[model samples]
Target: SDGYTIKPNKKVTYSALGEDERMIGFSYKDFGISSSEKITEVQVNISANKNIGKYVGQFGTSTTDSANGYWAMGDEITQSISGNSGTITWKVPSDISSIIQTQYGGEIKFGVWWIDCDEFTIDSVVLKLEHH
Candidate 1:
């Protein structure tokens, strides 16, 4: 394409999120920096779902089946959010270089968690990557 190189991007999906953290998790292959590997945007999708409550999103270097292990990204995806299935997007971090060094180069995982909400379903996950 253009001289603008694009990095590799990946996504993970979940049927329904229970009380466990391992319920919904995902990881992307290592995208080297300097050449310009960066995460542009993170999007969480919810579709054909019912009423839900309390949700969370996290990013980290490792993929763990346990809770409290990843860096708490934030809780911006809640049905109280848009009142049903919708898409939540997070912009790319400006200080991504520092994060890259701290994040596991092998792969980066994003985890979704919720409390007492079994009806909460993850429709899809999306990311945009740019590389040299």
Candidate 2:
């Protein structure tokens, strides 16, 4: 098994009045993943100042920056966030995994769209990828 943990290059936060979508980007160009390698799991670790109680509207991916591009391959999340700081163990579904594999050698961006959330600062955004 091979794995990598990625940290966002910028800060991300969410407030009810803030921008509807907060984008986080990760780069894996240096990971040297080959075509034969298969992405098996994708996880996201989010650390926030307050509990996110089913406030997230959607989690999606985009090839371009969230400012100019739209999100795709998104999942509508109606479940409560696990904790103030917790990991989404299975955040990326099969289709998203396929997209990541297809874009293995470049940057992949994720957007967190919220329906309603308090003024909480996202202190950390970690992306974990596993493959074999």
* RMSD after CA superposition, every candidate: 7.2, 5.4
Worst 10 residues of 1 by lDDT: 1-10
lDDT digits (tens) for residues 53-114 of candidate 2: 65554444433334434344555555567567555543666555554533433544545665
Model 1 / residue 96 / CA error / Å = 3.1
Runs of candidate 1 exceeding 4 Å displacement: 1-23, 30-36, 53-56, 61-79, 97-107, 111-117, 130-132
lDDT of 1 by residue, 1-132 (tens): 211222223222344434464434443432222324455666666543554445565554432223534343433444344355556565656454224432353344445644333454455656566655
**What TM-score quantifies how close candidate 1 is to the native fold?**
0.48
- Clashing pairs for model 1 are 7-130, 7-131
